[PDB]
Structure formats: structure tokens, C-alpha cells
Amino acid sequence: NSQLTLRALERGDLRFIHNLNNNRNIMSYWFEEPYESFDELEELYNKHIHDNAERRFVVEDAQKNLIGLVELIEINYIHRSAEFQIIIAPEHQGKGFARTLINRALDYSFTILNLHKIYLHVAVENPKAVHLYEECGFVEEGHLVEEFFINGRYQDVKRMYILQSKYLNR
């Protein structure tokens, strides 16, 4: 876990991202459609190079294998909030890495970006993920009813948050 590192997404990482963004199971966790041509991915990457409202990271191990991704999006200049999102590549799921990645994202948010609040959304049908986020200090602030159409029906999600003061006072 101490060997896992976050770094900025680069153009050379996009084939890795393309595999994730076309995976039905993975994209269901992001409430997203699993369809994205390499050209859509790359042109959107190009469009957002200078966009200050997001930070997209890839996660690598000590051997520079790509493990997953973490992103902070909708970063707000006044309210000092952002949304957190995470993917672990299928081959690295279930290795106990997620806690470390969540903590690295919170460290970045609260010690580098000087944010006040990080929030996330997670399906109520993924209670193991809800419980992992709770272990990391997130607390439920909403239960959003039929928010997303995911796999053939409308599904509910928890909205969960953590504040800078709680994180820095651990």
C-alpha cells in the first residue's frame, strides 16, 4: 500500500482509461454508459487540458503497473467542495488497495488543494462500498431516490461527505 502512488493523467495512459470506460461493470459504478471511442476519450482529454475544475490521477505501483484511477471533479472556487470518484482495474480489485487510494485523494484535497468538503455518490445496492467509505470517515448526508438509470431501472444512491477539519484532526 505504501508503494502505490498518484500522478497526473498523461496522454500515454489513455489506452488504459479506454479499457475501463468501455467496461460495463466498471462504468455502472460511475452511473455511466460503457461506450467511448478512443477518439472521443482523447478529444475530451485535449479539451480539458487547462480546465482547473478537475484533477485526474492514475495510480501506479512501484513497478509502474497501472492500478486504477482517482479523480476530483466539479472543484468549486467559492464553496471549496469537490466530488471524488475512483476505479480500480479488474485485475487489481480485491487486493485491499482502495482504502489507500481514498486516503491519497483526501490528502490531496485537504493538504494541497485546500478544499473544505469532499463528497461522493455510491449505489445503495453496493453496501460494501458504503461501508468502506464509512471506514474512511465519510458520513451519509443523502439517500437520493431513483437518481440514476443503471442496468434497466432507476437506482438510489447515498451521498456521503467528509470535511477538511475532520480529516486534518484525525
Do residues 117 and 101 make contact, with C-beta atoms less than 8 angstroms apart? no
Cβ proximity to a copy of itself, 59 vs 87, nearer residue: 59
At 99, the amino acid letter reads: R
Q: Does 24 bind a copy of itself (CB under 8 A)?
A: yes
Options 91, 95, 125, 149; binder of a copy of itself; rule CB under 8 A: 149
Residue 121 annotated as part of some ligand binding site: no
Mapping DSSP to helix (H, G, I), strand (E, B) and coil, where does residue 130 land?
helix
Min dist CB 147 to a copy of itself, Å, is: 7
Residue 31 annotated as part of some ligand binding site: no
Residue 85 annotated as part of some ligand binding site: yes
Which residues, listed in sequence order, are joined to residue 72 by a DSSP beta bridge?
55, 84
Q: Does 126 bind a copy of itself (CB under 8 A)?
A: no
Cβ proximity to a copy of itself, 38 vs 127, nearer residue: 38
Cβ proximity to a copy of itself, 135 vs 140, nearer residue: 140
Residue 133 annotated as part of some ligand binding site: yes
Q: Does 57 bind a copy of itself (CB under 8 A)?
A: yes
98-117 in b/e form (b: 16+ CB < 10 A) is bebbbebbbebbbeeeebeb
Among 63, 69, 64, 92, residue whose Cα is nearest residue 8: 69
- Would you put residue 74 in left (φ > 0), alpha (ψ -120 to 50) or beta? left
- Would you put residue 19 in left (φ > 0), alpha (ψ -120 to 50) or beta? alpha
Q: Given the rule CB under 8 A, which residues bind a copy of itself?
A: 5-11, 22, 24, 31, 33-40, 43, 46, 49-50, 52, 55-57, 77-81, 108, 110-114, 116-117, 119, 139, 141-149, 151-152, 154, 159, 161, 163, 168
